[PDB]
Design a binder for these strands. Structure first.
Lengths: 398, 908, 400
DNA sequence: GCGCGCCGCAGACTGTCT
DNA sequence: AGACAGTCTGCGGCGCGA
């Protein structure tokens, strides 16, 4: 229940002590810890591998955080202060100021608008083949009515432009594949779920959920847009909107797959944590090897051999060279026994612990401890880089 | 008329007698072991103009119902019987498709075989796929080789159409086709996939082989091994195995059978297509000659041992089916099967954490007090014997001096230490790390390994599942012993006290039930323990049947093959192909002539937490057409009830069995089964299986072990108590149940079936064979009576469906059920005809077993389904998130009543 | 100026015509970047993360929100982009209608919730818990790439600049020496991928309380423009943001405890992208970007012959290069295929390092054409060693 | 009621160490 | 150079589908 203390003790969550579920789900957290930032980077990298670079015709795009042009009243219950609530009752001391939302910009609440704006240029980039995609990971701002505040959510959005005849199965394919990405990296994949839903105008769609301990919460929405937004934004002509499906030029139906990576991070952090059955109440965050922020922990042994710090720096640098994040625990001072240090790396979700000791200058053997199994291996210091790369790659495979 | 809620009869006269001296026996046996105070509310009467009789008798009506039709199938069978084939064609040229092979050589090419009688067989190339190959059509005109595009290398890859043998000519007659496994060749006849009806029917050699001299269960294997336990052994020499290379030696004689020893025809790729093609074609021609000879000698034996033409015509119409699967059926082959893969990869992951959390023990010997992982290895082993400045190259040279330092004190060059320091059970179940099959964690670990019931806490008082001295199970029940805790695995060796592993259990997924209660939990861990042992319950159906549901070959028909009813409909898609799959079902698969198919003809009812239980679902009708079908409300219960009629007096009130199941209901009253055995016994859904064990004729010990399976009864407690249902229902015969004339029919010599006179298998014939086995012949009586009921429906819908202008004739009978693919415009009237045949057949059985009147409560259906798709009930769902989403559902209708006062003719 | 239309045509810079002026690109009021520009920005951020955060064992990530909560915002002090609430941006109001406040009492100048202008402030709030992270060891760092919102000078525009901040907590005695550390290290990082490193330079400067500073400049063709700045600010910001007890403020240095001086290293990745584009451009129209920084590494083509078999082997090579982590342009699945000297020098304008031509020789023996961006020669190579050549490339340019 | 998979297990060989 | 580590392989059983 109260596992969040660990995310404050080992810095995955924000600095402020009065953290609750509502502030985390709404986006009013003060920030994330460095391990949380690295877990967000791992989640974004896995999303980019599974969605963007592997799948053909998916292209990167950026949306600005602000909308510069004039626009409608917008998504606010309170209609600024010019119309909804004025100071006193209609008093004026005396224009350019207090011009309401006529010339006022808007912070973005979705990445769909930027991708739809860049659709014509990105269709010019491609050879106008109609199966197409635009992907973006970025921070979206939402007003939260705590009674007003800002909630910042890292949203990963894929806008898939699809032919209308096959949109009903393209949405089902992304329903399978996005839910498969959530089924991957999960200790309990049954907590991730999906629900079929309908729009107010009859458009179908799907919503992906995670079963948090308090209740089921939304993490991703797949929505079908039948030319409602694409035709509205470009109403001058439909000739520029026409794309080549096979031989025929037709207007593409839109599919918005928008998930939030901060709540996905919280879902994976809750999924990693699991005080029943055996008496092994070990506080370990069982993150996946490709989502764990720190892969390996490197340390100094009890024996007073000063020269081994050079060996630790060499191993640290060769593991940094080949894309393995290392906790520099060899710099640590007054280490108070190995068991709470091991519990510290278990709470930080570090896959392996490397103990460079006095007996590694001869015979090349360093101690290695796994996160999953609390057992030690006297493995040679050579080919450990290949072993960690093989472990990460073959954990990615299955 | 109003005494038992009977109805007036327009047909079936000659029952002018009142059944005198039989009514008061029914009254005195209703007042004993029966309430007799039923209000007996009259059902609403039904009046409609029925077609008249044939010979003014129901026996004379159902006779010549099977002779008005199938008379072409008698003269074509006679023409196949009388003629003599040319001995052997030696050439067997490649040619192109069909080629006429007469008495001479010279290989004259023909487009299609123009003969009314054909003996036929297909042996397909299994490695290429399901395309027909090596089909020879022997016939009194010619041997008729059909090479099926084996000579031409180039062919279509998928979406197979216009491929099979094309035996049907254009109109610008009836062409009877015989063959061993004629369903397998019938999938490759061509024009059996057409949406409109076919004038051509089929005969199966194994249908006549299991119709006379068939083998049920015990005799079938006994004569396999040969090729009371001590009897006359005449069933050995009088019958042969249903599979090939046994029928030919028994009836024809001579050689046993030719057989290819290399057996590469099922293993033939695109290579090896040219080698030994002639020897393969010679072996196939010899096999079809063997089937021709055995069919020629078994034609009069079948026509005289089954002299009622209803049996032969019912085999003829049940041999033809039509199961139209939609374009999303292959979608069912995707979204189910890959989902199984998902539940294959999650559950194994849920196993691996259960291993990994098991390695968090041993720290100060955390095992040896845990009752699941105390007897494991847990052993240790280890051995070895032979800028301001850069400041970066020193670390590089330090590690590169530690590199190549492995060369001295390398313990072995190729690493033998496979995870030393890990426990010995965890030194197993891990990939080597030297092989390319390496994958992280404790992989290559399965459910069936002996360490798996130790990893997850099975908590059946400490259930180990250790294979030595087990035989599938162990002493696990209760009471006193070992560590004086219930303690299944303390000291196995001296005593198996409190034994529950008495050998004789099914031992084969018997633990799929008793997951719900009956102990057998999955530990208090929550996250990974109980997440598994529910997943195998989800994938138990698809794990054993993914091979059978797949490789069901489908021919998506083109736009030209779609008739005018399909084209230009309000609901129609040319992208959606509605080509059918023909079922590979034998019309006689046991001693009874019931259709047997492991894929389609099973008890599947769209059960939740099952991956692929929507197999009965889909099978969407073509546009403009409707599947109209009805489950029989009470099949074997009513047959055994009217079997008791007129031998312990008539008027359907002979026994307490004969009184119930027609006036009683499932919701209220005693209709046997669940309603009275929830009072006699504790079974709720197992009460149906128990009562089927009584009625089907198993006996006391089968019921004893069956109730032993579901309960903590001791064996003396099983003998003394709770077996009294068999004692109270059946007294000493050989009370509420009568088994007298059932046993006399089981011991009757020549006439066996009461309704048709169809003989029993000669293996179960009591004159030639001293059938001292028992407990299988009563099964033959009840199941073959159900077969005769099925045949009496199938001989019906002729001149209530033939002369009347409705299309149909697609028998999709599964267990006790009848479906017909008719037009949507006359679907309600087709359901009315499907009610009319239910009236006529139940009156036929009432005509045969005693008197001529029939009660109204069984005279019509409770429901006939006019649903688009096939399902058990019309308002059901499936394990997919929504049945109406994706494929469209019209949700069906019950339609219990007769329709209206419209004309019985169309007259549109 | 020709570089602007080349980058627009080859989809480095988004927007039709509004980004043609260099003043829109020097600020952040350009409408966006192309997919090649977005991948280049991701490459530059990843290389900055490896050079600053990964390779230094003490530099740690930080998470600064794009907005301040602004509940106790000072009136008329750092009042740039205050209004927010997801739906208003009033920019700067020199003239105000003071009926009761600037706009309202609870809306403007109080509880406004200002958007961020620099990422130094987020690291300065997270300093206490990140000091707990390094077990109070003083000279450590907090670094982050983030978007900065600035006013752009009748209305005032929004400038969104992608900037990397490194905030260095140091003991004050060696603080100028750590300034000299980052002074040469950031400059060598900017000269690491430069085709001509003489354009990048650094200069010294003076402020009122920091008393020292260094500005890193790039020599654009119009003139020298700031791409990175360094400042040794005192404990004024830390004591201002935490008034009161200094016991949480001071940290453990060599044999003692002392309050840390802060070093602010702020680099504009958007001006860095513009600097590297102007450096990559120099006869024929090419973009000679660095192999570590180029958005697309290899260009795989379909060639000439049967389309199905070449398509299948190109799909296999594409999946192999994707599984090995190399970004590859799909010049296959395009049926245009005009002639020579077009689709070549278009990939050079797309800054793709190598281009692969898969022809019928690949179906014969496995040989494909490789043409380099740096040199115009073509080379015959097997399929199996293409991945090994491409993995020895880029990494060869990384280790000079 | 059998063949064919899928694990245990007990040789018997295989290979290496000193 | 035999003494002594470990890897296939050929049996028994158990379930279980054609």
């Amino acid at each position: 229940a109260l596992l969040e203390i660990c995310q404050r003790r080992h810095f995955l969550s924000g600095s402020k002590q009065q953290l609750s579920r509502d502030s985390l789900l709404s986006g009013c957290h003060p920030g994330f810890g460095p391990l949380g930032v690295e877990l967000r980077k791992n989640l974004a990298a896995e999303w980019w591998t599974s969605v963007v670079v592997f799948r053909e015709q998916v292209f990167p795009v950026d949306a600005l955080h602000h909308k510069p042009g004039p626009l409608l009243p917008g998504d606010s219950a309170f209609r600024l202060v010019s119309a909804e609530t004025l100071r006193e009752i209609l008093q004026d001391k005396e224009a350019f100021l207090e011009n309401v939302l006529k010339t006022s910009g808007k912070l973005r609440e979705n990445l769909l608008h930027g991708a739809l704006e860049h659709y014509v240029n990105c269709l010019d980039l491609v050879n106008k083949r109609l199966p197409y995609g635009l992907a973006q990971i970025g921070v979206c701002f939402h007003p939260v009515f705590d009674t007003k505040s800002i909630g910042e959510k890292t949203e990963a959005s894929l806008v898939w432009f699809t032919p209308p005849r096959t949109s009903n199965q393209w949405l089902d394919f992304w329903l399978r594949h996005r839910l498969q990405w959530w089924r991957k990296f999960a200790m309990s994949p049954s907590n991730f779920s999906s629900s079929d839903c309908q729009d107010e105008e009859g458009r179908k769609g799907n919503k992906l959920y995670y079963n948090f301990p308090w209740g089921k919460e939304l993490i991703e929405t797949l929505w079908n847009l039948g030319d409602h937004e694409l035709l509205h934004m470009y109403p001058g002509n439909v000739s520029k909107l026409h794309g080549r499906d096979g031989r025929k030029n037709v207007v593409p139906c839109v599919l918005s797959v928008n998930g939030d990576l901060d709540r996905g991070m919280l879902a994976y952090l809750y999924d990693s944590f699991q005080t029943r059955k055996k008496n092994l109440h070990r506080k370990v965050l069982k993150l996946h090897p490709c989502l764990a922020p720190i892969k390996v922990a490197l340390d100094v042994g009890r024996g007073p051999t000063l020269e081994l710090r050079q060996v630790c720096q060499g191993l640290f640098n060769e593991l940094l060279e080949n894309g393995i994040s290392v906790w520099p625990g060899y710099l640590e001072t007054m280490q108070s026994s190995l068991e709470q240090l091991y519990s510290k790396y278990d709470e930080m979700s570090i896959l392996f612990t490397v103990l460079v000791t006095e007996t590694t200058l001869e015979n090349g053997l360093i101690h290695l401890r796994s996160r999953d199994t609390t057992m030690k291996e006297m493995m040679h210091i050579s080919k450990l880089k290949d072993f960690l790369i093989k472990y990460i790659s073959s954990a990615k495979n299955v | 008329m109003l005494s038992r809620g009977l109805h007036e009869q327009i047909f079936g006269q000659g029952g002018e007698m009142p059944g005198e001296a039989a009514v008061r026996r029914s009254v005195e046996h209703l007042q004993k072991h029966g309430l007799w105070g039923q209000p007996a509310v009259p059902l609403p009467d039904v009046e409609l103009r029925l077609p008249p009789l044939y010979g003014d008798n129901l026996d004379q009506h159902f006779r010549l119902l099977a002779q008005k039709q199938s008379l072409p199938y008698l003269e074509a069978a006679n023409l196949l019987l009388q003629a003599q084939l040319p001995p052997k064609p030696p050439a067997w040229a490649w040619a192109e498709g069909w080629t006429r092979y007469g008495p001479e050589g010279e290989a004259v090419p023909v487009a299609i075989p123009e003969e009314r009688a054909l003996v036929f067989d297909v042996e397909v190339c299994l490695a290429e796929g399901t395309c027909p190959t090596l089909a020879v059509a022997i016939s009194p005109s010619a041997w008729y080789s059909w090479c099926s595009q084996r000579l031409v290398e180039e062919r279509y890859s998928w979406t197979s159409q216009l491929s099979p043998a094309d035996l049907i000519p254009l109109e610008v007659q009836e062409q009877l086709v015989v063959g061993h496994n004629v369903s397998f060749d019938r999938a490759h006849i061509r024009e059996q996939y057409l949406i409109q009806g076919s004038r051509m029917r089929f005969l199966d050699t194994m249908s006549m082989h299991m119709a006379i001299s068939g083998l049920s269960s015990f005799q079938r294997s006994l004569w396999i091994a040969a090729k009371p336990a001590i009897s006359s052994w005449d069933w050995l020499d009088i019958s042969s195995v249903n599979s090939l290379a046994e029928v030919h030696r028994l009836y024809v004689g001579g050689p046993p059978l030719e057989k290819e020893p290399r057996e590469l025809f099922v293993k033939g790729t695109m290579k090896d297509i040219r080698e030994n093609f002639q020897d393969l074609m010679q072996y196939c021609a010899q096999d079809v000659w063997a089937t021709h000879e055995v069919f020629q000698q078994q034609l009069p034996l079948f026509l005289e041992r089954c002299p009622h033409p209803v049996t032969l015509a019912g085999m003829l119409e049940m041999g033809v089916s039509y199961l139209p699967v939609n374009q999303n059926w292959e979608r069912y082959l995707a979204e189910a099967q890959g989902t199984y893969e998902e539940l294959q990869r999650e559950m194994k992951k849920s196993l691996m954490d259960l291993a990994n959390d098991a390695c968090q023990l041993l720290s100060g010997e955390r095992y040896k007090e845990d009752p699941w992982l105390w007897d494991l290895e847990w052993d240790l082993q280890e051995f070895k014997q032979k800028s301001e400045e850069e400041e970066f190259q020193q670390d590089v040279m330090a590690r590169a001096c530690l590199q190549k330092l492995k060369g001295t004190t390398e313990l072995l060059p190729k690493r033998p230490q496979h995870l030393p320091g890990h426990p010995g059970w965890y030194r197993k179940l891990c990939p080597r790390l030297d092989d390319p099959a390496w994958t992280p964690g404790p992989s290559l670990l399965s459910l069936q390994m002996r360490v798996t019931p130790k990893l997850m806490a099975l908590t059946w008082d400490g259930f180990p599942l250790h294979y030595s001295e087990r035989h599938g199970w162990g002493y696990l029940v209760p009471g006193r012993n070992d560590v004086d805790i219930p303690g299944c695995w303390f000291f196995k060796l001296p005593h198996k006290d409190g034994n529950s592993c008495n050998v004789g259990s099914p031992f084969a997924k018997d633990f799929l039930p008793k997951m719900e209660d009956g102990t057998l939990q999955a530990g208090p861990g929550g996250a990974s323990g109980p997440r598994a042992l529910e997943i195998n319950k989800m994938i138990s159906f698809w794990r054993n049947a993914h091979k059978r549901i797949s490789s069901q070959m489908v021919v998506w028909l083109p736009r030209s093959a779609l008739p005018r009813a399909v084209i230009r409909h309000p609901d129609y898609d040319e992208e959606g192909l509605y080509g059918a799959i023909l079922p590979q079902v034998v019309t006689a698969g046991t001693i009874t002539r019931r259709a047997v198919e492991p894929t389609w003809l099973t008890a599947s009812n769209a059960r939740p937490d099952r991956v692929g239980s929507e197999l009965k679902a889909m099978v969407q009708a073509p546009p403009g057409y409707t599947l109209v079908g009805a489950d029989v409300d009470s099949q074997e219960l009513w047959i055994a009830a009217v079997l008791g009629d007129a031998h312990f007096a008539g008027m359907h009130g002979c026994t307490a069995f004969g009184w119930m199941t027609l006036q009683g209901r499932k919701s209220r009253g005693t209709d046997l089964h669940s309603k009275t055995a929830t009072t006699v016994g504790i079974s709720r859904e197992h009460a149906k299986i128990f009562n089927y064990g009584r009625i089907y004729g198993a006996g006391q010990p089968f019921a004893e072990r069956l109730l032993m399976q579901f309960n903590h009864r001791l064996t003396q407690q099983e003998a003394a108590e709770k077996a009294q249902q068999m004692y109270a229902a059946t007294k000493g015969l050989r009370e509420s149940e009568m088994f007298n004339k059932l046993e006399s029919i089981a011991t009757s010599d020549i006439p066996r079936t009461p309704v048709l006179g169809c003989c029993i298998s000669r293996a179960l014939e009591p004159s030639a064979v001293q059938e001292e086995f028992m407990t299988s012949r009563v099964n033959w009586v009840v199941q073959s009576s159900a077969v005769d009921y099925l045949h009496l429906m199938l001989v019906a819908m002729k001149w209530l469906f033939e002369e009347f202008a409705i299309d149909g004739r697609f028998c999709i009978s599964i267990h006790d059920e009848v479906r017909y693919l008719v037009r949507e415009e006359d679907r309600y009237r087709a359901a009315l005809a499907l009610q009319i045949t239910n009236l006529l057949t139940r009156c036929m059985f009432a005509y045969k077993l005693g008197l001529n009147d029939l009660p109204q409560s069984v005279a019509f259906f409770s429901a006939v389904d006019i649903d688009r798709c096939l399902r058990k009930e019309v308002t059901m769902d499936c394990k997919t998130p929504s049945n109406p989403t994706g494929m469209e559902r019209r949700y069906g209708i019950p339609q219990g009543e007769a329709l209206d006062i419209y004309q019985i003719i169309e007259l549109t």
